[PDB]
């Protein structure tokens, strides 16, 4: 219904080049490969997508002044105007904004330390109707802005980078009891 803290979601777009609904989502490996990359989801029946390296987990939502409070040095629900974290659900690295380029569009990498404004992202409404202060429903289109670099989570042409041009981003849920078969899992298949 809404996007509560400490669950598992994605980020996603549609790439349009000459009547393409090329639905790319966001993935990143880490592990000797810091730069984030792409994963198409339009070609689903074509190719089962490698979805284990795409998901993310929210650690913490606060307000902007609460982010200043942390920068002096409980499953709440996020609102438009919160600053969030995004750990990579597989690798354990936190998603940040690198200070390198590949113009002045900054690269998007994974890192370790939660200190500093690299790991943090504000949310902004992609609606004239739905605006600041209210909740974020499932599947709301939204814009993500870094705290440090103050750039949008831009989809370039096909790069993914922090830039001064806006780019829509949709969020879809993935997951949220013990001893019980729960999908997306790796396991053994016994015989006897």
């Amino acid at each position: 219904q809404f996007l509560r803290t400490d669950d598992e979601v994605v980020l996603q777009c549609t790439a349009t080049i000459h009547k393409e609904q090329q639905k790319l989502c966001l993935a990143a490996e880490g592990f000797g490969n810091r730069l984030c990359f792409l994963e198409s989801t339009s070609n689903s029946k074509n190719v089962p997508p490698d979805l284990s390296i795409c998901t993310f987990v929210l650690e913490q939502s606060l307000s902007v002044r609460a982010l200043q409070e942390m920068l002096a040095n409980g499953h709440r629900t996020l609102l438009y105007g919160h600053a969030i974290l995004l750990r990579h659900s597989y690798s354990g690295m936190y998603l940040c904004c690198l200070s390198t380029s590949r113009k002045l569009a900054f690269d998007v990498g994974l890192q370790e330390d939660t200190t500093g404004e690299a790991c943090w992202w504000t949310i902004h409404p992609a609606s004239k109707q739905r605006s600041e202060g209210e909740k974020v429903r499932v599947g709301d289109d939204l814009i993500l802005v870094s705290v440090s670099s103050e750039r949008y989570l831009h989809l370039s042409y096909l790069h993914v980078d922090a830039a001064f041009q806006q780019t829509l981003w949709s969020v879809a849920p993935i997951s949220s009891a013990q001893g019980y078969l729960i999908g997306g899992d790796v396991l053994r298949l016994l015989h006897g």
Partner: peptide
């Protein structure tokens, strides 16, 4: 360090990255 003053100043680093010096030497003798 006042926080956001650093980040605005970094944005100012981000544009015209000291290639200004070409304009510094090129003007001064025309």
């Amino acid at each position: 360090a006042k926080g956001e003053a650093i980040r605005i100043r970094s944005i100012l680093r981000s544009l015209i990255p000291l290639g200004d010096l070409v304009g510094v030497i090129s003007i001064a003798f025309q």
